[PDB]
């Protein structure tokens, strides 16, 4: 019954494969000490990322093409190759899909559809349109304050983004007639999408329990003899985080203003639509009960490290509660396509970047940086190390892997050339937080919010580059002078 | 705006939950030598399967609830617990989803949607409705011939079902107005679904390359000192397979007839609808070409063991070709809910059965049966071993794992009690083939065809039980005397 082919953007293929081909041919001229497979994997990964920007096919199609090409040129098995002694000496593409980040985000997508089905989403949206809808930046500051308060309680940033702030932004933009993948997207949806992302960055920076890279940094710094202690982290971050809480939202507002900037009659419009919506119903009350069990289990996860409190498992059990309760048919959860899309593409990207790690590319880079800096005072060693830890996150889809790979090497560099370990440790952990202001695979929240269709990826990458400059300036300078005002060095 | 709740079948919970609770509560009197964790995992598994038949929720919902319950009672982590030397000492629930069987079947589901989207399916359906179909048992024997022909070439049984025979059955039954999850299913669809399953069983029985358990059996028999020789297997199976090729289709036709048994004008109807479909189009030409590249890559799978020829990867590569050409939009591939349903539920069931293995349940069973059979002549030893090898496949979601677990133990039993090594090696390998006539998770094809909505699972299990009796009689006795005519025992 199909007559013509789907319109495919073939020009989108010109840039990635050309880039890949060119870097393929530069394999004889690799830096030395590397590996031919390491350089080939770098080539395929960069080609795939450029494909995620030039968009031949949606990102799922581009990452599927990348994964298929990866297997085709012999850089990754399909099944895990097992040691002899049980170890997996090289992992295949099918294990890509047993990833915690992807599964947490996908199940969070399913519960967000639950929220919007009940009608709870629009109830929360109208409550917040009444209390801050007068002036859009009021709503923006509302959700940044909400994220900042959640930072100290919900120890995983992806749970905060996919469970709370993204449902809020979606609801609010639906009540404003702002739908994704549409010109309509720019009435308020895109500004609040980007603001949610950077609020998540700020909340991760404020608390040592904002994201797992923070705790990796804490363990690695403790290995070298420096104890971060929540209050230590909090007091070191308080003033730079506040300077950022004022600078970043306003630079976003000037750079990415939200079309509709004032709703002078927001209070009465919101009250009317809450009155017509009627009192809360039993599907919405059930949904709220499951939502607060998800929040409470995520918070207890912070104190009890057990499987039953795993952030992905909390989402799984929340959705199975949603199924047994009757809020959600399983045909409702099945054709909620964002979950399976993110499962495909984010798992493939995490796998390819992990291969970048496992072939010795990041290790070679750490060794290169260890050998290249020698005749310099420790202040400039610190500036250069902050810059390198920042910009190497273009080659990471995790954050925990980034810290595991480069935090202890860079920290040993800094202390080996005279810099004080507490200051350097704090600076590098902060850079590990502000790394998120880069790619769409930087962390979980970046993967959610760069893909919802409200913010194009041109704008995402460019504005994140600008904000990364501002974040580094803020944290570097303000945090260094604040951290000796408090006595850390 | 949701008004009232989705209807949930709560009575469906009584039987599984009752069974689970009682099997939990009799844990102290477990058979002895069995871990409490093995017995508890057994209880959860039986509860989940009983739920898949009593249906408190769709199969995805019940297996998800089962997996959540598994984690809740401390029988499975969420992340893999790794040794401190790379070994995995306990496997978590997220690794379940990097499964080749589930992913192969899911990508085949999306490629079948491609076939039926282009209109290629209905062209194939009308060609065979014109060449067979005036009498529906003609269609049944046609698809049985198709499976029999593919058995010697395409080494994966699920690839044969999901890549070829299921699209054929769906196409034909859509052209016969026999449509799933409704009474209309009984015009011809259910008959062709069940007949496809058993054609796949027979073709797997005919050739030593019919499914992976065959090659596991041959390697184990060589470990014990008996060499199967393709022609060996073919010659030993041919006459029993022919007796089955005559008996089983007729027993299915009498037991499960297809309401529409005669189409007196089938050839002219098919010629009419082929005339009006018009000449083949470029979308269908592209789809047919990628289909036959999939088939040739699957046949090369039989001779070259390389990742680029992996049957799951071949499915991935076929779908990415379908994406590059434009046959399939990526939103088309995203809202095909059968693929994600099969991924979820089949991955969870394979995971739970694996836990059945890894906790030592099947090992205790092998040792118990080793202790139980002692004072009996070897003919009765062979009968009871065939019976046990058949009926233990209710506690297996793989088949390869079943063979790896119990084939060499049962064979050492049989040979240790006087039986001739070639005879029971062949009898147990045949039993491993005809094991499929059991559950809906028996093998890949069983999970595909038992779930399409054409065959209820009540009738599936019951009719599979009857046909399993018939399969055992045929293969056991007829194959034993036929294998005595040849120089085997």
Author numbering:
A (entry chain A), B (entry chain B): 0 to 488
Q: What do the study's own words say?
A:
The mammalian SLC13 proteins are members of the larger divalent-anion sodium symporter (DASS) family. Each protomer consists of a scaffold and a transport domain. Structural information, along with cross-linking and computer modeling, indicates that DASS proteins operate in an elevator-type transport mechanism (Reyes et al., 2009; Drew and Boudker, 2016; Garaeva and Slotboom, 2020).
The structures of LaINDY determined in malate, αKG and in the malate/αKG mixture are in an outward-facing, substrate-bound (Co-S) state. The architecture of the LaINDY binding site is similar to that of VcINDY. Notably, within the binding site, density corresponding to substrate is seen in the X-ray omit map of LaINDY-malate-αKG, and in the LaINDY-αKG cryo-EM difference map, in a similar mode to substrate binding in VcINDY. All three Co-S structures are not only similar to each other but, importantly, also to the LaINDY Co apo structure, with pairwise r.m.s.d.s of 0.41–0.52 Å, indicating that substrate binding introduces little conformational change. In contrast to the similarity at the substrate binding site, major differences between LaINDY and VcINDY are seen at the cation binding sites. Similarly, a histidine (His392) in LaINDY is located at the equivalent of the VcINDY Na2 site, with another histidine (His401) located 4 Å on its extracellular side. Based on these well enclosed and sterically occupied cation binding sites, it is unlikely that sodium ions bind to LaINDY as Na1 and Na2 do in VcINDY. Rather, we hypothesize these two positively-charged residues in exchangers act as permanent surrogates of the Na+ ions in cotransporters.
